[PDB]
């Protein structure tokens, strides 16, 4: 039954994009590692921090009214 915000979420890599990276948490909700959403280090390449199979920890940054699960990658 949906989840609660403010909790941590293990974001698995289930999709990537040239202008960023997509992510999923399984259970009916997914996260997104957009290009400007990786690590303090410049990740000009989203395919470098995001990999199909790499599971990284993130934090439910929040969810606007667009149901866009905004996950926050930690520092994997």
From Swiss-Prot:
It is found in: Cytoplasm. Induction: Expression is negatively autoregulated at the translational level via an RNase III-dependent mechanism. Induced by cold shock (42 to 15 degrees Celsius) (at protein level). At low temperature, the destabilizing effect of PNPase on its own mRNA is less efficient, leading to a decrease in repression and an increase in the expression level. Involved in mRNA degradation. Catalyzes the phosphorolysis of single-stranded polyribonucleotides processively in the 3'- to 5'-direction. Also involved, along with RNase II, in tRNA processing. RNases II and R contribute to rRNA degradation during starvation, while RNase R and PNPase are the major contributors to quality control of rRNA during steady state growth. Contributes to degradation of some small RNAs (sRNA). Component of the RNA degradosome, which is a multiprotein complex involved in RNA processing and mRNA degradation. Interacts with RNase E (rne). Homotrimer. The homotrimer forms a ring-like structure with a central channel, where RNA molecules can bind. RNA molecules bind between neighboring subunits. Might interact with YicC. This is Polyribonucleotide nucleotidyltransferase. The S1 motif domain is important for trimerization and RNA-binding. Belongs to the polyribonucleotide nucleotidyltransferase family. Residues 6-74 form the S1 motif domain. Disruption phenotype: Decreased growth. It comes from Escherichia coli (strain K12).
